[PDB]
């Protein structure tokens, strides 16, 4: 909540863009980590 | 030196997509 509160508070339909960016970045980070691991 | 031939050629594909 503090996370979402911060990205809502600091940075015309902009908050939705920031939130979608955050969720996509996080999911992609976890998936990239797993694929890079099993690539050994 | 995997990359060298790409410069040596100069100083001197997922067939499922088609």
């Amino acid at each position: 909540s503090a996370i979402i509160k911060s990205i809502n508070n600091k940075t015309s339909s902009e908050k939705e863009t920031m939130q979608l960016l955050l969720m996509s970045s996080s999911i992609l980070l976890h998936l990239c980590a797993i694929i890079s691991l099993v690539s050994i | 030196n995997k990359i060298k031939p790409y410069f040596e050629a100069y100083f001197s594909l997922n067939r499922w997509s088609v």
Partner: protein, 101 residues
């Protein structure tokens, strides 16, 4: 079913575009180059030299002025990372040799 048959016969180009071209050869390389140049401090070994090596290793061919990769690298990397400083360098080191100061 009949409607899907008629619609498949008239949209082969758009189909191949959206399935094979949209991401892999249009959006992903743009995103990758812009992302790399957003990180990667404003030197030349990082903004121009290593990008070329990695691009040729990945794509399997060198970026020449005939390709969009060379021009994207040139503009973003060179013009917005090393030029605003190498400009001052040449304006303070090589232009005095010639006539106009």
């Amino acid at each position: 079913g009949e409607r899907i048959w008629a619609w498949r016969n008239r949209s082969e180009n758009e189909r191949w575009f959206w399935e094979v071209f949209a991401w892999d050869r249009l959006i992903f390389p743009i995103l990758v180059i812009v992302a790399w140049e957003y990180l990667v401090p404003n030197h030349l070994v990082w903004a121009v030299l290593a990008p070329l090596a990695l691009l040729t290793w990945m794509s399997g061919r060198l970026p020449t002025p005939a390709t969009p990769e060379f021009w994207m690298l040139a503009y973003f990397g060179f013009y917005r990372k090393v030029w605003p400083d190498a400009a001052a360098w040449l304006q303070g080191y090589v232009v005095p040799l010639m006539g106009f100061a």
